[PDB]
């Protein structure tokens, strides 16, 4: 066929399915699956992602992505009207600073987002933190320094899916919802998809954007077991709050992301609600529920550190989702040695910032194009990157466990936490060493298998050891 | 016509359509059970457990306790007689036949170290078993060890029920004893909210925190019938790390403005934390962030650091019917009324439904009961000075619960600073009335509006019954 | 006679000693007091040479609290030639007075909103009115420290030229350049100062002797006005001074290493505040806690050392903790009760005060003891200091209102600085039942006068017998004034 | 005569001094030391006459710590009589040696359930097995304490017969009953011991002096052990004994009252713990850190103080927050590198040694007294004290897998005791992380010897060339004695 099948009905899904359907409305284009957020480009930027190359690079496609947001947006509500909602819930995001954390994340974070918002030549000011709108923290708990960041924004993802859907039908997209159990390729090119009604739908291309199950999906055609790249569950945690006078921020309100890719955020939405988030936990099993320790973090850093009012506030929804957490810790976007299949997934806390770039990159493609500049080190077929020294990653890992505890905030002996970062080096070196003599996961990751058990551990050694064979 | 659908009123609908075949019974609520108590509850068969030093120190009190005590004998039989109407599928009734009560120094020595003593002193004198334990001897729990309990207390037939098991236990036996569901609620004492109109003999209201707004809008009653407020409570359901739990119910005595901390154990690798308690002069559906934590760190800390890392299935929001004089509404009036049971109306069902059937009968039903007649001018259990006291030390208790950390010289401070708003809010209300210590503290942080509206209710009662 | 006896052996009573001695070589000065310096607030301090890290909103605020910040400008521009004056005496193994030239002033979260970020912006803006020499630097350049993380520093001020003295060594030299100047030291205590005829006669002494002088320089710190007071009708028109009690330590650092420039916090709840000090030879001073009380005390309380220790411990440097504790110092700030000092002359003909300078006596010494030299020799002295003449009505520098919500800030400021961890409506609830009582004082102390609030908690928390015997007081001031 | 000279005038010196003078008429007896009293455990010490109090599971779980337990036990039973001898030589203006006949243990949740529940227990059942007089108490019935409610108390054990004595007061006491039976004080330090031919010459002083003797006397507390060393071989034949630095405080309370009993928690971690212990005059004694040094250190840390004052405020009376600090008291517990004092003769003749008594040589030092002196005169003294002969191999009282559970634990233990609040998977990931380097160390510094928990966490945080000195000194006594 000239079909296209996508695979998967979430933001990166929906999106291709639109650009796809618009841009060849002669061919059919069926889209497969069952019934905060930030738009996080400057306010995602790290010392430590700047300080790798693969790191800039992703960072470079988050910039290029903001760039396509407004007229993105303007095609999307083109095809609603007034009633349905507006996609965009905020403009501007301010980035604050307080001390319930890490110096060594948050302090060269900060520095990091100035740096890389200056040599974007993007708008933005160090503002007085008494000019920062509504927040009312605890003293103990306050930020001494803020950055307004003007046109990185936030958007309403309830509003954007049901957008998406209408514009994929009003561009002539079907919408057919059951999952594919599985891809069907010979002679190394697509046939099709079936799907778990035991139907087959054939097709000359199929997007693979089914979230953390796409590599599992691509891996069982001959030989891709260990050419693609494991995708995790980041087990994310957010909540819905309807504020006590119905009142919210008129900016997204968020730090620097935190320990293990966690973070704390307030999201504004229509009709007296506020989003708060997010927690982040590298998970080697899915998991579908928040956990106590997971709902306790999240609420005391927003009580405390952004609005004392959310105290006295109703817990409308605790919300669970799967970040796909890619092993070697970027995206896997674009072709495969087999032709007409493609992914779109691995995005962890950005695919829905960079949907729209995703799907126009992988149209590109699809046309016989090239695409975006600077996605080929993200090819969905490829070695683990190695994005970062051994040492780099158990300096991080390190890090990132103390930050655990400042970030809480703990209150210990001053002696202790010198003791807990010189016993805690000996342990992650020895589990780096063990693993693999040329892959080291990332923090995020690292921290998962440290305390996963033996069987778990031996199993990613193996793992590890069958894509070096595979790849040298 | 038996208006509420909780515990009360499928428990009094039961034992009227079991003792009756030959009249009609037909019960109203609908399945959502808004602000329903019921479903929001461990729930706690909670007699010794439930004992406070302010609560025996009071006629209205033992009193109270003592139909707490009667009520325990009720519940094997009880039990029995409901799973018999269904089968072994329906699952099980009784989730725990002990209760362990851990002392640990996360609270108020005021409150816990006063109430562990009431509750030793109450059993021995019912002659109840049960035994002082060491802490190490405490099954399954695994406390952070700066919570953890220095004295624990065994309590032998002390249990809790599957509140969700209960209540569909309660309706399959009301049907097969041939009462009749109509999922419609009463708006006038009775006319329904789809705009019917049910003719009855009897009327027994049993509609937790809404029953006294009902039966007030008949001639005189708006003054003669003492008001129920919603005593919200949030509780949770977590499925455990590893499918374990307590074999005993685990839990403090009532702690600061009748909150307090218990794990109740239930079937399928769940458990039940509770409670919050947080008395509001209007209803709220939703659970705070502030109540979601409280109950989460209390958990966490004092009874298993495991529950840090479960999965959150349910956060459960209910309304105890909070009675403005601090005791239950049971009985006839010048038409019943079964609530206002505030913590234990779950516990004392069986003896609440087989008292109103009787009175219903002719008969005089249980014997201590009379003190709580609907239809009364509002007790005063406790002298102004009493309640006083209690309101400053529930307000102390808010911070050592927390548990907060302070400079030494803070809480006395407080203490000092919070004693002239309490007196001069008590003086203000009414000559004769003091709301107990939860109204209180509710009353206290309301609108002056809301305030001037209960000196004019309290000032209403004086006239109509003095 | 023409003798001139100084009552005091503190850094005012030595320095305007020094300035009497240098300037009448023709008369004989004595300078009273015992090397044990009983309450003597100068040998507990650091001291820093404090001015604009002095700023407050609150203070910057009064037109009282402006004038006295433009005499603490004045008197640091007097520290080079006047340090250079005092060492000349003295020989290389004497030590140097300076130990600082520059201050960091550092801003962290531990502490209250409404003091901690309203005086970290107004020491800003009072450095670019004055033109002074400052830069905001990065913390990260901020040299030395290593505080805790959750008590770190978000913004840091270096202060150009503002330092800090050796106030042992300062002392020393002091006492040396009084003796070079011809000066005599006697060490007892003035008992009680002689006056008939409008004029003083002389002081009687503690070991029962008779100094006779045509001039005494009361300098006796927080004695000051009670020495005085005992005259006739000076009880109700020399403005009563307190105790402000404040607890220093002396630190051997672990490593014998110490910060190059001062490091301090702006002010803090009721006149405390943090800061280290250097000292020669691997020492650190820090500072430094304020309590006024209406009775003197000599010892640290538990609660004083606890707090200073665990401040500087967590948002200057964890190296503290493992470091030697050398010295726990006690000394008093004289406190005047309306928060101004009592400088220059009274009734009593040849009778002068220095005292009541609270934080900053040490750093105004010899801008004060000029102003006093000049006015004993009949000049007019310093321009802006005629308006804390010792004989005055108490000084009203604030309304009732401002003080109140200033009272109820720093109670609070208290928590913040601890500091606490409460449920979050508590501090709300706290601060609503914080008012009433604090307004019901105030009205009840007295229908014109309001003391401050290092005053005002201080008087809350005293007996009853002690509030009515203020009451009395404020008056008897009323009557004597009105 | 034949001379006897006692080297070191705490305690243990002293009470021997007076043993041998009034025992020996034959003999003059020197007691050398000075008023000072460097790095002097007795007057930084209470002090309490701790027997059940000093339980704890682990030392009544080795035969060595039953056996040190049994003495104390027998110990006891002399203080009435010894008390009576020693005031005798004094009259009422000398103050009361005894403070309190009876003890108050209390338990809160202020530290490690692994140490603090055990111990409880430990310690009634080790007053239950001696049919000693106790009883558990409602905490309600204990008088004067005012426990922050987070940190109170919920289980309190009453022992009676079980004091404190005031140590200054028992120090002046032996001095003056040491001169009454004509002993004589020589204010000086021993630099060295002199022998030849197997046989005690004398000792070397500080002052350039040598006095003769045929008995020497070595009960110079931490120093004991380092002065004996430098005779030939003794170095790898008498344990070494490194100084358990002690705080302490005395504290002029708010309102001049105190316990009328000792009030104490069980040993803490690495043999630190919190008592009060009553005093004359409106005074309590609050103590008491401990931690081992590898060198001897005179001054308190700011975490030392800290520790100590913000347990004894939440745990014991909030009123010691705002009560006078009077003194910060350092001492030195001759802390044996084995876990076990050093008590009687050495293959020198007229050598003898007692030491390295830790936490309760004072509580010991009438019976240690008695034994030494009967050995002087040819008898055998007390039974039950031959093992704790100063001339041996090292003790091992543990098993390394019993001392590396203890020391992961007291690690732990100085967390809970603090107290901090952590993440609740913090705790178990630490304990899991500690294991690998506390077994490392351990099998790094000898195949045969493990030091006791207090030692090892010391040596854990010491430089590399200290560990490197202790593995030679480790393996040079494995050569001596193997
Ligand atoms: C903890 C602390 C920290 C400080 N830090 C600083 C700082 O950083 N910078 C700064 O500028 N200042 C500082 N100060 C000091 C402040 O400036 C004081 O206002 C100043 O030292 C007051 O000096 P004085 O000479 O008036 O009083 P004192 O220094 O108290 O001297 C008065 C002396 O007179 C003696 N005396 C009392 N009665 C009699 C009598 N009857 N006869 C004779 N003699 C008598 C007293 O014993 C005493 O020695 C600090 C003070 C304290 C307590
Ligand atoms: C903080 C603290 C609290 C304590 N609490 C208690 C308690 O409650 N109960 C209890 O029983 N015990 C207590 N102790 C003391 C403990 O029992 C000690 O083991 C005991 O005091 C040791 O006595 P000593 O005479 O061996 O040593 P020390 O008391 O140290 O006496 C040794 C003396 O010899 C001197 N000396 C050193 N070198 C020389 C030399 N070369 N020549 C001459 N003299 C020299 C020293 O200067 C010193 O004065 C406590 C100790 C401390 C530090
Ligand atoms: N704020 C970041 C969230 C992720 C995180 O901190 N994970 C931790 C770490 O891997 C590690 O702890 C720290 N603090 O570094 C580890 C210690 O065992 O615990 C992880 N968190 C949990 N993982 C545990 C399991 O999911 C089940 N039980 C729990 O309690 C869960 N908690």
Request: charged fraction near 20%; hydrophobic fraction near 45%.
């Given at each position: 066929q000239t079909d296209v099948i996508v695979v998967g009905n979430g933001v990166l899904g929906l999106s291709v399915g639109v650009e796809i359907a618009r841009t060849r409305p002669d061919v059919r284009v069926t889209?497969?699956?069952?019934?905060?957020?930030?738009?996080?480009?400057?306010?995602?930027?790290?010392?430590?992602?700047?300080?790798?190359?693969?790191?800039?690079?992703?960072?470079?496609?988050?910039?290029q992505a903001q760039r396509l947001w407004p007229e993105w947006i303007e095609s999307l509500e083109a095809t609603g009207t007034a009633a349905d909602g507006?996609?965009?819930?905020?403009?501007?995001?301010?980035?604050?600073?307080?001390?319930?954390?890490?110096?060594?994340?948050?302090d060269?974070?900060?520095?990091?987002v100035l740096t890389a918002l200056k040599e974007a030549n993007a708008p933005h000011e160090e503002i007085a933190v008494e000019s920062v709108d509504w927040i009312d923290p605890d003293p103990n708990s306050r930020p001494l320094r803020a950055l307004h960041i003007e046109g990185e924004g936030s958007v309403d993802s309830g509003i954007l899916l049901a957008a998406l859907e209408?514009?994929?039908?009003?561009?002539?997209?079907?919408?057919?919802?059951?999952?594919?159990?599985?891809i069907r390729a010979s002679h190394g090119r697509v046939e099709g998809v079936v799907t778990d009604d035991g139907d087959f739908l054939p097709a000359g291309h199929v997007v693979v954007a089914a979230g953390a199950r796409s590599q599992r999906l691509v891996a069982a055609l001959p030989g891709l077991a260990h050419r693609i790249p494991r995708?995790?569950?980041?087990?994310?945690?957010?909540?819905?709050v309807d504020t006590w006078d119905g009142s919210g921020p008129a900016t997204v309100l968020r730090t620097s992301n935190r320990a293990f890719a966690c973070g704390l955020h307030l999201v504004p939405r229509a009709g007296g609600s506020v989003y708060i988030g997010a927690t982040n936990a590298v998970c080697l099993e899915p998991r579908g529920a928040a956990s106590i320790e997971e709902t306790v973090f999240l609420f005391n850093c927003a009580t405390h550190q952004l609005h004392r009012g959310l105290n006295g506030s109703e817990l409308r929804k605790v919300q669970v989702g799967s970040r796909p957490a890619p092993?070697?810790?970027?995206?896997?976007?674009?072709?495969?040695?087999?032709?007409?299949?493609?992914?779109?997934?691995?995005?962890?806390?950005?695919?829905?910032?960079?949907?729209?770039?995703?799907?126009?990159?992988?149209?590109?493609?699809?046309?016989?194009?090239?695409?975006?500049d600077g996605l080929?080190?993200?090819?969905?077929?490829?070695?683990?990157?190695?994005?970062?020294?051994?040492?780099?990653?158990?300096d991080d890992v390190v890090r990132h466990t103390m930050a655990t505890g400042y970030e809480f905030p703990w209150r210990l002996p001053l002696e202790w936490?010198?003791?807990?970062?010189?016993?805690?080096?000996?342990?992650?070196?020895?589990?780096?060493?063990?693993?693999?003599?040329?892959?080291?996961?990332?923090?995020?990751?690292?921290?998962?298998?440290?305390?996963?058990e033996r069987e778990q551990q031996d199993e990613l050694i193996a793992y590890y050891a069958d894509v070096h064979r595979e790849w040298h």
């Open positions: 889209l497969l699956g069952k019934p905060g957020a930030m738009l996080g480009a400057f306010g995602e930027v790290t010392a430590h992602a700047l300080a790798s190359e693969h790191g800039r690079k992703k960072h470079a496609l988050a910039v507006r996609i965009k819930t905020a403009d501007d995001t301010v980035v604050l600073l307080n001390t319930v954390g890490h110096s060594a994340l948050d060269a974070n900060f520095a990091a209408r514009s994929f039908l009003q561009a002539g997209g079907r919408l057919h919802p059951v999952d594919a159990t599985e995708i995790y569950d980041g087990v994310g945690v957010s909540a819905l092993i070697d810790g970027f995206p896997l976007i674009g072709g495969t040695s087999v032709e007409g299949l493609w992914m779109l997934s691995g995005t962890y806390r950005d695919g829905l910032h960079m949907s729209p770039l995703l799907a126009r990159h992988v149209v590109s493609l699809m046309d016989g194009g090239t695409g975006v080929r080190e993200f090819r969905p077929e490829r070695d683990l990157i190695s994005a970062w020294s051994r040492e780099e990653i158990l936490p010198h003791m807990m970062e010189t016993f805690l080096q000996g342990p992650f070196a020895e589990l780096a060493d063990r693993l693999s003599d040329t892959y080291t996961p990332p923090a995020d990751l690292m921290t998962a298998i440290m305390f996963s």
